Amino acid sequence: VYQEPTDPKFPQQWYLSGVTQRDLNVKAAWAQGYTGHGIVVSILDDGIEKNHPDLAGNYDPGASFDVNDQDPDPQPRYTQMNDNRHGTRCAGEVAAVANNGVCGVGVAYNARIGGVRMLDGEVTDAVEARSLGLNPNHIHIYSASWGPEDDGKTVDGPARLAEEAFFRGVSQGRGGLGSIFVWASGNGGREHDSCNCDGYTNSIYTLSISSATQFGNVPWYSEACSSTLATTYSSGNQNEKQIVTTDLRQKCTESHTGTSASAPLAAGIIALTLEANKNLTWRDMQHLVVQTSKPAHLNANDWATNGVGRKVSHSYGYGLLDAGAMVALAQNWTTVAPQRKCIIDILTEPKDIGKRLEVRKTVTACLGEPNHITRLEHAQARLTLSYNRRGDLAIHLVSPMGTRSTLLAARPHDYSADGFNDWAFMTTHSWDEDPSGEWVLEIENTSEANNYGTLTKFTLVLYGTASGSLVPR
């Protein structure tokens, strides 16, 4: 009985529906009756063309603001180079109108869509905070495709107001269920960037998304890191198809690209999922993504099976989002227990790094205490170290269940002598593992240079619960 959209470019949206099995299985969710009705998504970007013929029908002024000019109207600034086209492209990915003879369709083509104009101007900590904290009892899902420079030498994350906005969002947002922050993992592939050096995507509060090409490969622009949760399709080489969406000046484009296109698609899938269960918390949503995402047909040289039997890659996280499976699992989902936080100060003395440093530590993960964790979610190694050339370092963390997470890969362009100042390297790869036992931190000099430095602090921070495990996969 379900009739798929008749829009003129819907057949070119290969990532939504295909015979191939090389899609996000979104039609299966639509057929179950989930199209995004009642869900509100906001694009945090350079503005949104609210009068676009494929966005006007779903546009929501309540999900919108202009932080750059301080007014409610997020209309893009028009220029000859069409610089401010990105928010409009992203909005169409989430929620372009269906069955209206214009362009293609959104993943959640019945959701409401807004945008925050905040990239077109000086982007301070305050600007970020006011955008992340926009109408958090009206907006359900935020999508952001921006972050620290992808030059492969930057280490940067949210400053105080922005970090406060994240904690207020997940704590009190959406009636206490928590704002859903969907984030693009980065486009610094060409610069050999490592996305744990981006504090926005590396955050536990953001649901971070990477890209795969049409033929199932790691795109040129992709950044690998342990903080990434999952993947959606985006662009690749010039024989591979691209993203079809709404463009500036009321146009339709078939050439939207990069990881910045992957986050909105994920945000759309998350909107469908929220429609299927409005009671899902921000942590519930990340559990659903971990359990339902699909590695199959994604090519990577680093696929590994973790302690509970799930395949995970630093390029793809747990794999391709599966909309049909997300909405199915959401319906009878039992809310996870309150989040526990176990803090373990590892070092008894500073340690010289030299050519290689290995730190072994057996932990009880707060045994006997209210923060006792037997089911891991995120894990962080918060490190403070000095080093003469930061990009020569590679850092790995091994869980008691034997799962080796790359916290930091060599970054050839990172010549900084500034080291890391309590930087919270995060991994999702040990999700649902029991964290009791021996953890191993490995720091190594990947270059032939006589480098030098000292690790002065290593805090292992474990998040999770002590109840509700599934039989391993």
Ligand SMILES: N=C(N)Nc1ccc(N[C@H]2C[C@@H](NC(=N)N)[C@H](Oc3ccc(NC(=N)N)cc3)C[C@@H]2Oc2ccc(NC(=N)N)cc2)cc1
């Ligand atoms: N890439 C896009 N899609 N848009 C876009 C276009 C241009 C930019 N350029 C950035 C450059 C950027 N430069 C630096 N941060 N160093 C600039 O930041 C400022 C600006 C002013 C001040 N001082 C002050 N007294 N106000 C301090 C820092 C914002 C400055 O941002 C703008 C943006 C637009 C405008 N003009 C306008 N809105 N009519 C002015 C500055 C950034 C983004």
Ligand SMILES: N=C(N)Nc1ccc(N[C@H]2C[C@@H](NC(=N)N)[C@H](Oc3ccc(NC(=N)N)cc3)C[C@@H]2Oc2ccc(NC(=N)N)cc2)cc1
């Ligand atoms: N330092 C210099 N000499 N120049 C310089 C270098 C970088 C910036 N930051 C700007 C750069 C700016 N890029 C350009 N003007 N080319 C970037 O523009 C974007 C990015 C993404 C999208 N949307 C999308 N879907 N792709 C749209 C416009 C915003 C991007 O804005 C920010 C601002 C803050 C942050 N946060 C942070 N760094 N902690 C992230 C991005 C500004 C000035």
Ligand SMILES: [Ca+2]
């Ligand atoms: Ca405005």
Ligand SMILES: [Ca+2]
């Ligand atoms: Ca349409």
Ligand SMILES: [Ca+2]
């Ligand atoms: Ca990056």
Ligand SMILES: [Cl-]
């Ligand atoms: Cl915390």
Ligand code: NA
């Ligand atoms: Na809460």
Ligand code: NA
């Ligand atoms: Na994240």
Ligand code: NA
């Ligand atoms: Na153990």
Ligand code: NA
């Ligand atoms: Na061991």
